Amino acid sequence: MPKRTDIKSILILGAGPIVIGQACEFDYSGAQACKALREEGYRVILVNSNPATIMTDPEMADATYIEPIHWEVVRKIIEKERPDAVLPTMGGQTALNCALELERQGVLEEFGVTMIGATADAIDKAEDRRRFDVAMKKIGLETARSGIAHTMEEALAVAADVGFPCIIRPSFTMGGSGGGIAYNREEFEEICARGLDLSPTKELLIDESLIGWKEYEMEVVRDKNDNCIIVCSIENFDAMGIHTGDSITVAPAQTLTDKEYQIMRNASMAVLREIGVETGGSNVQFAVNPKNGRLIVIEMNPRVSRSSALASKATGFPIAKVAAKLAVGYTLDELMNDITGGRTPASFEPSIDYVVTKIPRFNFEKFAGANDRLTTQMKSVGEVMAIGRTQQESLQKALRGLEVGATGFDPKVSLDDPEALTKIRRELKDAGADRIWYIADAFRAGLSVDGVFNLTNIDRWFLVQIEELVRLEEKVAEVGITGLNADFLRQLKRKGFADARLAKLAGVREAEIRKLRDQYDLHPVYKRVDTCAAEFATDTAYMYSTYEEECEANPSTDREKIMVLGGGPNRIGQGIEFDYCCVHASLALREDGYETIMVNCNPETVSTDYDTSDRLYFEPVTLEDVLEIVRIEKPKGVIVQYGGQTPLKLARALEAAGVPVIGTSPDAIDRAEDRERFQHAVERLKLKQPANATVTAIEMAVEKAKEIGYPLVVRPAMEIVYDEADLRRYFQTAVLLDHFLDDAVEVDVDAICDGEMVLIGGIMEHIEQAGVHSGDSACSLPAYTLSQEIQDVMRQQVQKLAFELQVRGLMNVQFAVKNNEVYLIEVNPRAARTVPFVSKATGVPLAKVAARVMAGKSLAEQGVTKEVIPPYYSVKEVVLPFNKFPGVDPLLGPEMRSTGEVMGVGRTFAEAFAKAQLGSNSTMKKHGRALLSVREGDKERVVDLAAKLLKQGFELDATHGTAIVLGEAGINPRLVNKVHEGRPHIQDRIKNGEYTYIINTTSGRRAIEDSRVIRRSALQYKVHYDTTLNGGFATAMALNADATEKVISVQEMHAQIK
Amino acid sequence: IKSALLVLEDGTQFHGRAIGATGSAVGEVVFNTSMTGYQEILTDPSYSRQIVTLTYPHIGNVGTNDADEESSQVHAQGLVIRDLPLIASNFRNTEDLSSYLKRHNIVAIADIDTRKLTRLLREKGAQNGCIIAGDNPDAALALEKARAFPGLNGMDLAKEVTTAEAYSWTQGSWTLTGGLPEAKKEDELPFHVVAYDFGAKRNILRMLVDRGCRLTIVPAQTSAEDVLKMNPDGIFLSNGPGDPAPCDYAITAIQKFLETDIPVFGICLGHQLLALASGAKTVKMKFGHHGGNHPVKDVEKNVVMITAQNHGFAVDEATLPANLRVTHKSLFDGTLQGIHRTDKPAFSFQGHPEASPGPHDAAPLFDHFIELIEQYRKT
Ligand SMILES: Nc1ncnc2c1ncn2[C@@H]1O[C@H](COP(=O)(O)OP(=O)(O)O)[C@@H](O)[C@H]1O
Ligand SMILES: Nc1ncnc2c1ncn2[C@@H]1O[C@H](COP(=O)(O)OP(=O)(O)O)[C@@H](O)[C@H]1O
Ligand SMILES: CC[N+](CC)(CC)CC
Ligand SMILES: NCCC[C@H](N)C(=O)O
Ligand SMILES: [Cl-]
Ligand SMILES: [Cl-]
Ligand SMILES: [Cl-]
Ligand SMILES: [Cl-]
Ligand SMILES: [Cl-]
Ligand SMILES: [Cl-]
Ligand SMILES: [Cl-]
Ligand SMILES: [Cl-]
Ligand SMILES: [K+]
Ligand SMILES: [K+]
Ligand SMILES: [K+]
Ligand SMILES: [K+]
Ligand SMILES: [K+]
Ligand SMILES: [K+]
Ligand SMILES: [K+]
Ligand SMILES: [K+]
Ligand SMILES: [Mn+2]
Ligand SMILES: [Mn+2]
Ligand SMILES: [Mn+2]
């Protein structure tokens, strides 16, 4: 049938803040679904606490709720919008989990809301590990030997049945959250405890090992007529034992014979049928024994996923778009295939004439004490994708697009290192994030294909390819630049070697290689993505480079073009926020009539959705790759200011090569980024800046330090030293020297400059003081403690700087306020990650405005000239990945570790904060026992915090020094033993559920290390904790509020602005 | 350096690398979208005189094995691919692809812009071409032979690939566990079907056995009279190369069968024969259908099936005699895919219900055929 008519309104459950394992892929999917349903004339309501999402843009839906994704809150949204149906398959596990709670809570019944896409039963059938296993056996599909557990006792018994190593998998979790591989009992207990607690259903599935078998996935779509298609197959590079999300993966499958593929294909469809997915897609996972084709079913995800996004990018088939339409009664045969100009139906199986490779992006450097070995629980923060005509080409392109400074297979160990083979061996046997490079080093080191195989379990099919690339590199190194004849160079290019990689081997500048290609006229061609292996033409311009014969670009001669450079894979500090901007630049300009060209390779993002721009080049964001596109597009201007560090770093080089860079100049950018350059302008402008030095020698520092004055901020990773003794101390383990502004308020300011005027986008007051990374601080818009007097000063200071540095489009300024004095921390002449939040808060699409400015249209001309101060408070709170790395001390500092953020909207600051905190997955309660354990400098203010908690009904606990101060205040807390003190101590108390809140503040490397236990325990046991007094006060405040009391939509928020 | 060159009728050259036999090869050039199943494709008799181009870049990843051969030999005139992998990596592989081609004496080229090729063929339609692999491949020559190619239009190839003498087939389908099974004993198979060999795929036969059919394969040219004598529980019209049109013997026979009450089922070429025999007309498609992701709708049930296709000719829907009712159509182009006799127990499918390679989606077409048989026996 055609669309459903007994439905008018649809509520779509969003995914929430980005986290490891649940990332940008949900904005892309959610946006696609809004789009789809909206196109179908439905009334769409959505909830997503993540403000940096395109799906929350007011113009994408009918009723947008940026509210905490809690059933009580969603209930209020349902009560208030009275949706007819709810689609819970476009928002990660968060959406699944919420849909079911809503069901459980009977909320769905209460309001007569119909679940579409997938039913509650289906979802459970796939999400409940026991159920899933039963269904498989019921359809004769084999599963690993396993057992269910609901307690440690039961768990220990399964372990006893399967032995080690064993695989632990929680029910109702994904991304390997709460799971792992137990090699021993000790490990077993750890993982299991963790997963039981984390499981929404307090249930684990423990399996025997299949580590080393091949790992495959298949993306399936089924319609109500029972039509079923395989949209894409995926062969993992990294074998079973390493989560699909942390694995290198390629499409399509490579090593299965047609016979095996059919069986897999039949199994996949059977699984969907059994689980009951009747109107949407699903990801089905399997294990294959390379030795005999033995097929095992691992799991099924009744929703869109990071794989379905990847599959969509890979094949050109918009899974989520189709699924949303299926959700509403449409059948596959009824829908048209987007990219083939609607010429054909969606009911078909795509065929691709290229190889897709996805490589995960990690951030282990950011988590010192973390276990950096790859396992079944995802640890990756993002991913890149590449398209090549061959696997080698595909792989190498991905490596160079990874944003880790690789040009491909750069070496990790020295040839002349006596212990090199042992190091290699270890990295191979126990995969870390660097494995890919160690494989190459293995070949250079004399190890055979078979030897590498035995260690890694990666199929030889892939391995031989890397070995061949190594041998080719060895040739290059021998023949040097002289040997780079046209014939050979072409061969190299065809295998995907970057100019940079070649340059290094030939000992020349990458530019030399590039000139050499110009000489030989050796440039790549562009092929288009079409879902059908060229069987049908396409009107879409979704392309990738390759060294072939026929070019398919067909640039227009017609329009003025604007190029937008993406940031590549997401990483901590470089998230979705930047991609949001990129997207906006494109929608605006395109709407303005320019021909918009997007260059990016992040498979998860909306930026890489062919609908977002006129032309999409799915390529590595490198000078080489971008130069090639410019070469042929001859764009009017290129924007490098919106994709984060990635494109920023290419600005100078691009200009030098004659690229028409628009907006703030690369020189301008450098003035800001260059400490020295920047120190002069500050100086120039008669502005306040913390005392600084530039020390080369230890003893030089200690002297210069005396000058500057402690405490000190040592920027080369950053550290805060407090005394001379501390300085050396650092120096040992260990250069800019900056006086650290203690007890200071940190502020962020986002603005736009058009050369004529400066528009203040937003002044954000952080909760955590300066010293706690802006990226990890919660913030308020508008400020909640800052005098107008002082903000005005900052506003004036931002204008002074905007003009001086010649800003053209967006900027961001960071200040520190100490003793009614404004101190400049830094200037970022580009779009900052706060941009999306400010746009949401203020209703002003700053990325669109700044984009138009960059392109020629003034602020005056657009009618955006006055700063907006909204009638409500907007608070942004972050989410930290500490829970993924338990060895890590979960404490804040000058270095950013967060992955995502949420936004809270309130009539008061307390209300906004409340919503933000809840939205952040805080386990804070309004009653219980709190534990206070603060540093010296906080002992004074802790009294008032202790009282505030007292007024609330909390009971208090405290360690010695604190108890002392409180006692003198007349507050007598219940004494608590530090761990060395005796018993019970905090650990025991926290472990036994005594506390519902913890406030623990520490200063000093040593003090920190000592207090480590408190924080690590608070996290493990799920107690809300604050590591800043400013944070605790905020928490205090929020208690006076009720995050579920009232809900408002973005449309409503925005209408309130005068 | 072992060169290979491929030249099309239009003068379009593709310079690559030789990966099979040294030599030359001339035929109609086609493209196939199948990401898996290269071997089964190569050994498909319908590929006789056709030079096969595969759209999926890496061809040979799994090597080769005897179970994956659809016939006794390699029917493809030539093979055009983008990349020949360094190794074959699959537990079932018994011989790398190059070795295989060499062994079957097949001219093959790798390393050419297959996509460019594909779009050419789609845009301008099928073309005859020539592949030359040797020390110095003469383009001019290659152009000559390609241009010289007769063409598959009006070419009866069914007679060329057909068995010399009739035979019996009692073998069933492959299993992962069991591999290709031992042939069954005659008393073991319920029905007895007579199958015209128009360049028959082993999978069709195996799948028929699977359903309890004992077969007697017959040469293409066998006479109705001769068949009838056999007291067949049903008659089957296999797939096969070339133009169905020129197969007068087959048509004439079919008509004869259509006077009786015996069940008749045609697959691919057999579909076209049935159609012609009924009064319909066949056409040669622009580039035809070769792939394994082809949606086909069962108009009656309003259900779609992803199928394995391999045809360069079709039955014109607009010429269909009233005793022919349309059963299936392509979702890709709307072309005719299935027909059934309104008056007789005769029906056919343009695609390959037996797949191999390909989706198992259309397998049930066989089922119907059994039904008719079971019911023809009830009488
Ligand atoms: N029996 C097993 N042996 C080895 N690895 C396994 C086994 N079962 C699953 N895995 C690994 O664990 C990963 C995560 O399991 P999965 O069922 O997909 O959970 P999730 O839903 O969290 O993604 C798989 O992608 C695979 O690498
Ligand atoms: N001199 C200083 N005094 C106090 N806090 C500072 C000082 N310098 C930097 N910080 C803190 O360190 C953080 C990161 O420093 P910043 O210069 O902005 O580096 P980044 O490039 O990472 O944004 C700031 O957000 C702030 O919390
Ligand atoms: C994966 C996201 N969560 C699990 C569904 C944990 C951060 C939401 C609470
Ligand atoms: N915005 C940072 C997160 C706050 C965390 N509860 C802490 O205080 O450490
Ligand atoms: Cl989860
Ligand atoms: Cl086993
Ligand atoms: Cl086994
Ligand atoms: Cl860890
Ligand atoms: Cl509570
Ligand atoms: Cl202190
Ligand atoms: Cl070519
Ligand atoms: Cl014709
Ligand atoms: K309803
Ligand atoms: K699942
Ligand atoms: K089992
Ligand atoms: K894997
Ligand atoms: K998966
Ligand atoms: K801060
Ligand atoms: K910065
Ligand atoms: K070539
Ligand atoms: Mn899962
Ligand atoms: Mn999984
Ligand atoms: Mn900063």
CATH of the domain at B36: 3.50.30.20
How far is the C-alpha of A919 from the C-alpha of A16, rounded, in Å? 8
**Which of chain A's residues have a Cβ under 8 Å away from the Cβ of B32?**
none
CB atoms within 10 A of CB A551: 17
Catalytic residue list contains B192: no
- Please, are residues A382 and A472 in contact by the beta-carbon 8 Å criterion? no
- Secondary-structure class of domain A1-116 per CATH: alpha beta
Taking the CA atoms of residue A189, residue A192, residue A198 and residue A203 in that order, the dihedral angle to the nearest 10 degrees is: -140
Binding site as annotated, residues of B: 46, 240, 242, 269, 272, 310, 312-313
At A682 the three-state DSSP class reads: helix
Q: Using the 8-state DSSP alphabet, how is residue B319 labeled?
A: G
Give the Cα separation of A245 and B181 in Å (integer). 40
Q: Does the annotation mark B130 as catalytic?
A: no
Query: Which residues 6+ apart lie within 8 Å of A861 measured at CB?
Result: none
Both tokens of residue A589? Answer: 């300009």
- Looking at the fold, whether B132 and B162 belong to one and the same domain comes out as no
Tell me, in Å, the resolution of the deposited structure.
Answer: 2.0
Closest CA to A312 of A12, A610, A620: A610
Q: What angle do CA A269, A274, A279 make, to 5 degrees?
A: 70
- Structure-token match 């030889």, residue found: A460
Q: How far apart are CA A281 and CA A218, in angstroms?
A: 10
Interval between CA A157 and ligand 5 midpoint (Å) = 25
Beta-carbon contacts of A308 under 8 Å, excluding residues fewer than 6 positions away, are A25, A29, A219, A231, A281, A283, A319, A320
Nearest to A870 by CA among A780, A992, A958: A780
β B303-315/A43-47 pair status: unpaired
Residue of A nearest to B13 (CA): A549
Sign of the torsion formed by the C-alpha atoms of A821, A823, A829 and A833: negative
Distance CA A386, CA A396 (A): 8
Token pair in block for residue B370: 């059994």
**Do A614 and A597 touch, CB atoms closer than 8 A?**
yes
CB-CB: which of A291, A464, A533 is closest to B118? Answer: A533
B202 with B108, same domain? no
**Is the CA virtual torsion A397, A402, A407, A409 positive or negative?**
negative
Residues with Cβ within 8 Å of A485's Cβ and at least 6 positions away in sequence, in order, are none
Which helix (H) or strand (E) segment holds residue A621: the answer is none
Name which residue sits closest to atom 2 of ligand 3, judged by CA: A94
Q: B101 and B168 share a domain?
A: no
Say if residue B349 is in the same domain as residue B235: yes
Which residue has tokens 């093959």? B108
Both B160 and B22 in one domain: the answer is: no
Residue A901 Cβ < 6 Å to ligand 4: no
Which one of A814, A822, A824, A834 would you pick to mutate in the ligand 2 pocket, going by the greatest count of ligand atoms within 8 A of its CB?
A: A814
Pocket lining: A777 vs ligand 4, CB cutoff 6 Å: yes
Residues with CB under 5 A from ligand 12 (ion): B 283-284
Q: Is A573 in the pocket of ligand 2 (CB under 6 A)?
A: no
Nearest to B33 among A347, A533, A549 (CB): A533
User: Which of A874, A852, A867 has its CA nearest to residue A760?
Assistant: A867
Asked if B238 and B204 count as a contact pair (C-beta separation under 8 A), the reply is yes
Is residue A123 within 8 Å of residue A57, measured between CB atoms? Answer: no
Same domain for B257 and B165: yes
Q: What is the CATH number of domain A687-741?
A: 3.30.1490.20
Write the CA distances from A405 to A358, A622, A698, integer angstroms.
17, 10, 30
- Structure-token pair, residue A608: 């890489």
Q: Which of A47, A73, A97 to mutate to test the pocket of ligand 3 (most atoms within 8 A of CB)?
A: A97
> What's the CATH number of domain A922-1027, 3.30.300.30, 3.40.50.1380, 3.30.420.40, 3.40.50.800?
3.40.50.1380
Shared domain for B19 and B109, answered yes or no, is yes
Q: Which of B116, B150, B184 is the last residue of a domain?
A: B150
Nearest by CB: B86 against A295, A468, A548: A468
Decide if A1028 contacts A999 (C-beta within 8 A): no
**How many angstroms separate the CA of residue A474 from the nearest CA in chain B?**
18
What is the C-alpha separation between B296 and B311, in angstroms, rounded? Answer: 14
Confirm or reject contact between A539 and chain B (CB < 8 A): no
Ligand 3 atom at minimum distance from A15 CA: 2
Classify residue B83 by its DSSP letter: B
Cα–ligand 19 centroid distance for A688 (angstroms): 18
B289's tokens: 């259908």
Atom number, ligand 4, closest to the C-alpha of residue A898: 2
Residues B115 and B165 in one domain: no
Dihedral sign for Cα atoms in the order A689, A691, A697, A702: negative
CA dihedral A738, A741, A745, A747 (to 10 degrees): -10
Domain boundary among B112, B135, B150: B150
- The strands making up B213-219's β-sheet, listed across from edge to edge, are B167-169, B213-219, B191-197, B234-237, B264-267, B346-349, B336-341, B324-330, B282-298, B303-315
Q: A257–B86: do the CB atoms touch at under 8 Å?
A: no
Query: Considering only CA atoms, which of A701, A770, A706 is closest in space to residue A732?
Result: A701
Q: Enumerate residues 6+ apart whose C-beta is below 8 A from A483.
A: A475, A476
State the Cα–Cα distance between residues B335 and B285, nearest whole angstrom. Answer: 10
State the Cα–Cα distance between residues A868 and A846, nearest whole angstrom: 11
- The tokens describing A356, both together, are 């897709």
With contacts defined as CB-CB under 8 Å, which chain B residues touch A487?
Answer: none
Sheet of A719-721: strand order equals: A692-694, A736-739, A712-715, A719-721
Q: What CATH number did the domain enclosing B331 receive?
A: 3.40.50.880
- Ligand 20 centroid–CA B110 distance in Å is 8
Are B280 and B184 within one domain? yes
Q: Which ligand is nearest to the CA of A306?
A: 17
* Domain carrying residue B48: 1-150
Cβ–Cβ under 8 Å, residues A279 and A326: yes
User: Class of the A404-553 domain?
Assistant: mainly alpha
Total count of residues recorded for chain B: 379
DSSP 8-state assignment for residue A252? S
Long-range contacts formed by A964-971: CB under 8 A, 24+ apart: A965/A939, A965/A940, A966/A932, A966/A942, A969/A943, A971/A943, A971/A946, A971/A947
A920: burial class by Cβ within 10 Å (0-12, 13-18, 19+)? Answer: buried
Residue corresponding to tokens 């290094």? A504
Q: Alpha carbon of A505 to those of A291, A409, A463, A489, B159: distances in Å? A: 38, 11, 21, 13, 60
Q: Other C-beta atoms within 10 Å of A731: how many? A: 17
Answer with the one of B102, B122, B150 that is the final residue of a domain. Answer: B150
Reported as type and span, the H/E element at residue A504 is: helix A499-506
SS3 A79: helix
Is A987 touching B (CB cutoff 8 A)?
no
Whether residue A770 has its Cβ less than 6 Å from ligand 2: yes
- Here the tokens at position A839 are 């746009």
Which DSSP string do the residues of A324-351 spell out, in sequence order? HHHHTT--GGGSB-GGGTTSSBS-S--B
Q: Based on the domain organization, do B324 and B352 belong to the same domain?
A: yes
8 Å CB contact between A436 and A424: no
Helices and strands per DSSP (H, E), number in chain A = 39, 38
**Other beta carbons less than 10 A from residue A1045's beta carbon:** 14
**Burial class of residue A512 (count of CB atoms within 10 Å of its CB; 0-12, 13-18, 19+):** middle
| Residues facing A511 on adjacent strands | none
Å between B59 CA and nearest CA of chain A: 9
| Residue ranges covered by each domain of chain A | 1-116, 117-140+211-403, 141-210, 404-553, 554-663, 664-686+742-921, 687-741, 922-1027
Class of domain A554-663: alpha beta
Q: Is there a contact between A966 and A999 (Cβ–Cβ < 8 Å)?
A: no
Q: Is B268 a catalytic residue?
A: yes
- The CATH number assigned to the domain with range A117-140+211-403 reads 3.30.470.20
The single residue listed with the structure tokens 């288009």 is A528
Q: Which residue has the tokens 């005056």?
A: A860
Handedness of CA A742, A745, A746, A747 (dihedral sign): negative
- Inter-chain contact B304–A227, Cβ cutoff 8 Å? yes
Query: Which DSSP string do the residues of B201-213 spell out, in sequence order?
Result: -HHHHHHHHHTTE
Contact yes or no for A87/A102 (Cβ under 8 A): no
Q: Which residues contact B357 (CB under 8 A, 6 or more apart)?
A: A258, A262, B34, B36, B37, B38, B40, B41, B292, B308
Cα separation, A794 vs A763, in Å, equals: 9
Taking the centre of ligand 15 as the mean of its atom positions, its distance from the CA of residue A275, in whole angstroms, is 17
Could you tell me if B204 and B346 lie in one domain? Answer: yes
Q: Do domains A1-116 and A117-140+211-403 have the same CATH topology?
A: no
Instruction: Find the closest chain B residue to A334 by CA distance.
Output: B331
Q: How far does residue A402's CA lie from ligand 18's centre (Å)?
A: 30
Distance of CA A437 to the CA centre of its chain: 23
Q: Compute CA A11 distance to the chain's CA centroid, rounded to the nearest angstrom.
A: 25
**Half-sphere exposure of A690 toward its Cβ, with a 13 Å CA cutoff?**
27
Count of CA atoms in the C-beta half-sphere (13 A) of A1024? 21
Q: Let me know if domain A141-210 sits in CATH 3.30.1490.20.
A: yes
Say whether both B231 and B282 belong to one domain.
Answer: yes
Asked if the A664-686+742-921 domain carries CATH number 3.30.470.20, the reply is yes
- What gap in Å lies between CA A929 and CA A939, rounded to an integer? 19
CA distance A463 to B11: 39
Total structural domains in chain B?
2
Residue A552 to residue A632: CA distance in whole angstroms: 11
